[model samples]
Target: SNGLTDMSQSRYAKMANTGIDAVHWTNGFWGERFNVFSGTSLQSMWNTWGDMYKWMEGVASVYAVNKDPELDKLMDNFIACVVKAQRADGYIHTPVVIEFETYNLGHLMMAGIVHHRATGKTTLFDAAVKATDFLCHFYETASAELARNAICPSHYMGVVEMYRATGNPRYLELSKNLIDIRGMVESGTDDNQDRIPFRDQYRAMGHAVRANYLYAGVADVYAETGEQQLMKNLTSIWNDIVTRKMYVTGACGALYDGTSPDGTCYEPDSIQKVHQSYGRPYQLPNSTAHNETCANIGNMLFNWRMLEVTGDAKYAELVETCLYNSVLSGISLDGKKYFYTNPLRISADLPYTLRWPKERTEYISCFCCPPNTLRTLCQAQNYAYTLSPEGIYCNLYGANTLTTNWKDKGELALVQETDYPWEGNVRVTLNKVPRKAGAFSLFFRIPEWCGKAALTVNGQPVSMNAKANTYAEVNRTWKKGDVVELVMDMPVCLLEAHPLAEEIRNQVVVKRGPLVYCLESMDIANGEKIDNILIPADIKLIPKKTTIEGSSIVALEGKARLASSESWEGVLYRPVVQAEKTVDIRLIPYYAWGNRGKGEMTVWMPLAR
Candidate 1:
């Protein structure tokens, strides 16, 4: 509902320093357009990858926008600083004194990955790659101690990415070994906690931002190595989370210690709850459960990797849910200010509560999401399509069609046009083909929530067995004018989680296909945690036409009773039964969970009995 400007630039320029001991979001304002100041006297910190990435993003933007010799000099200067920081064994230590153990720092690792691709031979950034290999050497050594604890995995994925970029067996093997150590910990995941020193049991504990990076690393390793054991651990973590632990938005973790919150309720009226966990126990369910922005970004990265690794549509489905709803919601619509945590619910009465301890400033002590969002969005194109030996793979479906270079001595280009998310009518046109005779596999992703999808090749019905993440292989001879039309059935649905999740015994969240539902607390008038309740499972949702400004959305229509009425007078603390009168409720998609002027929202609720 407004216009905006971004100011996180100069801020990243200032905090550029070294050290592998740092985390992701805590890195720098490396990729933001707006310039701000990052470090001060008491708040002393240096981001390992901040300076390098700033140059990365800056150079690209500069080349695209204006060709200034000054900008080239600036990049050259930044490289000089990095070269000065390199240690013996080709390690470019953030701080030359710090050992390679801090290699978990992922930003430069990110640079090592992108630099090779962005510039090709990219001789300017070979120093970064050299440093990467040396660190991998340290990890690969059985005598190394970096294998001690499985902390937040930042550079883990970077290492894998490095291996992909460099074809270096050392990076791949070291990443595998590191992932091995993480799999051994019982609760060493996003929110689970473990007694291991400096190791967290809860996966959601990734609230620190660096924490999620570790998980992403482990997941990336599993993807590259196809490690059954690591994959087993990663799969177990997800089972425990989605089945019993996750927030409705597929979001998790809270920062009780930081008093950070989006809000602490799961009702429509309590809009602030989606942001923070409020000041509750580390593991309680509340909309305000302080869903740290860094952690949210980390989770998105993890989910994305998991989707690619396991080829599960659910993982990509969650990606859409978080990216559209919570991920984008974390950043103000303007892209300038952002919430440190997103609450699931909010209320008109508790106007004072919020997630960020600091104001809605340009950036922070750790300008992660600003740069992280940039990194993710920029590379978002890469995630768009991946490849195997025989055929090419297409994962996400958006407004733009995908053009893939196949290994089968053929090129496949798809032109997709549709108003997806809002409406479910996708039209795709195929480009390129071979004149001769040959059969090849063409893959298409059918979402997890998609119950039915109508397909036509050059206007003929063809059956498909595509499940979420798994590809629907279309084997056919070459035809230049072949047209594939697919219309997915995106009916609104209400979901009941596994019965094992005792948190929301009867709660159900509304969804239309992959999109989860949400309610704006501001629209709810006055409500609070426990009081603002779940809608009935059999409720109906109505979707309007699609338009640019918040159109193509669905609303809830049903009666569900609240367990507690509108009284904060100790009512929230004590247990209570359902209220006397049933109230009408509305919901938006899980991806759109946090858009309405910041309030509480819920993904889970009592499925009407």
Candidate 2:
């Protein structure tokens, strides 16, 4: 109910016909833009169902999580509409049939597969297979122009997922074919990962969201194909984004100045938008950062794939970083407003122009991110536990119960309780056993920040080394009522970007656990601009707590020097003043910055000399 209505209220307008009525209009052309019809009767009727595929996936994800009969009926009705709209020949999307149609079908195929997995409903899966069959035939002889222009790259994910669902080898072949075709498409472009061989590019480049989606699809193919080089290259690019190109809050896409939505370089008729992704390695910006919410969602998707392929704790740690900071930062606590571009600093004089709103808004013209955020929030719990050939892997720390009986590892149950992210104490209780006398490893991820960690099973010190940035496993005979306690030492620390990042040459921000802290104008005393505050190199940061909307969050209280009022009104350059006075500064999580009335906010600030 929440995810459905949320996207409906956004530019997607879920309540309208393109949503309820869209199922009926699938026989016509489909794309992001369309006109809503009053009744089903029209000579030519369409409404901007903008990105119907996202809507399909979002609603399906909701149904996947909750098997509510009401939502199932809603989905059944929705799928019926889509099935009717799909042509007998297989093509469904009418307008921009190749590009928009493929993108929408890709997501729909994924949604249908997930829906089938969740509810055992073959109706949706059959529809997806039908559409997939059509794509296979169309693209078989389609010209390079039509084949190369599939910009979204989500269809690759869709087809590969279909191959998994239907047990079809052709779908897998189609995915490989699409990847090769994408490489052949106009090379040297950022949006299309086609500039060079996909294996060679290591740094984050191109349209932020599209690049991640492509990476995600390739990772999916690699999972089944076991291609070592593919996984190697994906890991290289993944490392580049997390270490050098990403924001402190785990947001991707550094520069707002990039190619247009259609992958064009410049638009003389427009202001050359920069909300897509990044500029170059170590090119971090503050005010004009275009950290699209959808890009982070894609980052999470790619990270999840990485975790699955490698079984490394680092990938899951990155997912946790994104969930706690950038991904959650996109949606407001009350769920009414959203931030499309998450900038580290929102200058007071920042202009409220296209994609640069200083504050979260109810809705934006680019409806892509909002629905994408909705679906991610809906599927948050799935990433909590993963099943490996050995046993269950606890990728993320949270209060939840995990049961795995599908792979015949025995009726296993794990109950975990933790006050995580904010606090680092976790207790795991084994409720049921797959075996009573066999050895299996129960892995726990220790985050990178935890320099010191301790693990104990049944009140005995765990024999394994408690290492940070990797998983600490306890290979032991399974027994019911076994207790595992893990303590990760999380301390307040200052972070510095790479030196190539000239934007923050000498600046620092406080971080505790996974949350990245920031200074907001609302937290400042006496209406002082945060830009005027400077923290001494060895300043102390004390932990503080506050509750809002019934949830408690830990922030920080620190002392910083107020740089002596150095002012040259209307002057670009002025001599610096050395004198300063100490003042109290409040630091909140970067995710919580704009919740209060927007004013000056900065993640990184100058250090006092």
Candidate 3:
């Protein structure tokens, strides 16, 4: 119950989550962010719930990790209010309606479980069980058609988690029944991935958030039931997303508005307008990118589950990518501002208006992303490691101390020290080990971005073939002061888009390690527009230590040419003129942009011939 997903009873899981209280961030980038989140962000949030269920769920998650007494008291009061608002029939929602009832209830159940585990209080847990019982009864009598119509079915994972937490057979049965009932009726639409049964769907379609949620829930079900067909479909869809529809920063939802099954629909009336969609392969747009913060987090959630079920390092790599770049971009450095949608490019003069703000704001009317971001930041330490039958898997690298039971072997304690996302050197020291466990393996993930890596044990060379995008296993016997050191080569790399992605065909993106860098107007000399910057194809990007708004970061410095508009002279169509001047350009991490007053920013820059 303390872990994010209670995988204790999972049939097919290769890895299990550490308890929420097991890992503590002593100091590092994530530790700083967590402090800021608990100190400023949580307090600055809306006092009253705009999306009550989502807000409460986020608060519960943060409280579970931080265990603030003030937050506990606040949650107690809020739980009382929520319990009183429920009807005798076990239904509760604002606007007093069935709109997103299942979605709201799902969040409520998850919040209750997390809060109950963090503190031995069950006021919210009892209320959640009552609400779940009502759903169980309602679905028993409700027709399959009515049940399939429930949009945004987050409850599938919720109920499964409820079963894991409370050992309720009905909750698991309800989760299975809900999955089977989708697409059983012909009235379904692709907007919610109900046009075809989940078992049969291969490619990613429909609204991005809903699609990821369903996929993650299905993965959870497969972990419990060991269904082969579900795993097959999930694998195919995940490959489809990462290989084609995903962004460089591990963000999803390419199009703001698109048609489901575009260019392939047979029936004219069957076409559905999908918003915040995963568009056709290679249909990525920069300025118009609609990478909703929620969808990006959904991608992380799906990948985290995949990592649990498969124990593959690639999924952990994507989780790291999203956490450092796209997910962190959703909120500001100080944690007071938020972004509903994250775009790769921004400009001052655009022909059309953007649906969301270009800069992070203090408030968003639809406040789902802020709380979601908050909870993810607060619980980020959970992603640091995972437990296997034999040893521990280092999924992410940062400064933290982990103390957890090694599968009943005994208590294990380790300390990790590194300035990750900025440096590639990591040192893990074993402070405590069980006497019963003679030997255990410590697997360190080698990031795909690193070209080479070296490992040593107690200053002696360990002969292990360490490759990128794979984990290097170091197996050894017990020792109190044993130390392991890993050094990954972090070189600046220039990346290009697929040939078919015409929008950014001739542009290149700057990447160092797992962090993606961008050109911001504030970093340019003389406050020049970022659009005028053209990076030389052979430019050498040197990593330099810098700080943005009091936050230490690594910035890239290089030489590039700035285009001159003297030859155009306000002409609409003009011949190309070689009017350019050499200039020094500086690039900062994409997540660190817009914090110092936004002007213009672009992840992809034109390549100078």
By the TM-score metric, which is better: model 2 or model 3?
A: 3
Stretches of candidate 1 exceeding 4 Å from the true structure: 1-105, 133-152, 177-212, 222-227, 254-284, 303-315, 348-361, 408-410, 434-437, 466-470, 499-502, 525-534, 545-586, 589-609
Best by TM-score: 3
Q: Candidate 2 at 520: error in angstroms?
A: 0.8
Reference-based lDDT, residue 424, model 3: 89
Best by lDDT: 3
| Candidate 2 C-alpha lDDT tens digits along 1-609 | 121111112121111101110111111111000111111101111122334455555556545443557767867776777777788876775443332346566666766776676677798888778878888886786787674436756676778767766668899898887766655654346555566667677666677888888888887787777777886788788988887888877788876666433344375543234337766667788887788887887788788777766767788888888886788788665555678888888775555654656688766345567666755665565666665546556666766565555244556766777767667888888888866436787778888878888888888987658677788888878789999998888889887767888988888877898888888887777777667888887888888778654345787887888867755457777778774578887888887667767577888998764
Instruction: Compose the digit string of candidate 1's lDDT tens values, residues 352-465.
Output: 655353223445445544555543443333344444444544455555544444444545665655556555665556666644436765666777778777777877888877
lDDT of 3 by residue, 1-609 (tens): 368677867889998888867887878888888788877777777542235555666666667666778888888888878887788777886554322355577677778877776677889998888878888987888777784435645677778888888888898888888888878887687778888787889888878888888888888888888989998899999999998899899889988887877898799788888888899888889999999987888888899999999988999998999888888999999988898889999877767987988889988556567877877776788899988776889988999999888766678899999998788889999998988887889999999888889998999988868778888999889588899999888889999888998889999999998999999888888766677789888898898998877788999998888887553345677667574587788999998889988588999999875
What are the Cα lDDT values of the candidates?
A: 0.50, 0.68, 0.83
RMSD of each: 10.9, 9.6, 2.6
For residue 315, what is the lDDT in candidate 3? 91
Q: Regarding lDDT, does 1 or 2 come out ahead?
A: 2
- Measured against the true structure, the TM-scores of the candidates, in listed sequence, are 0.70, 0.85, 0.95
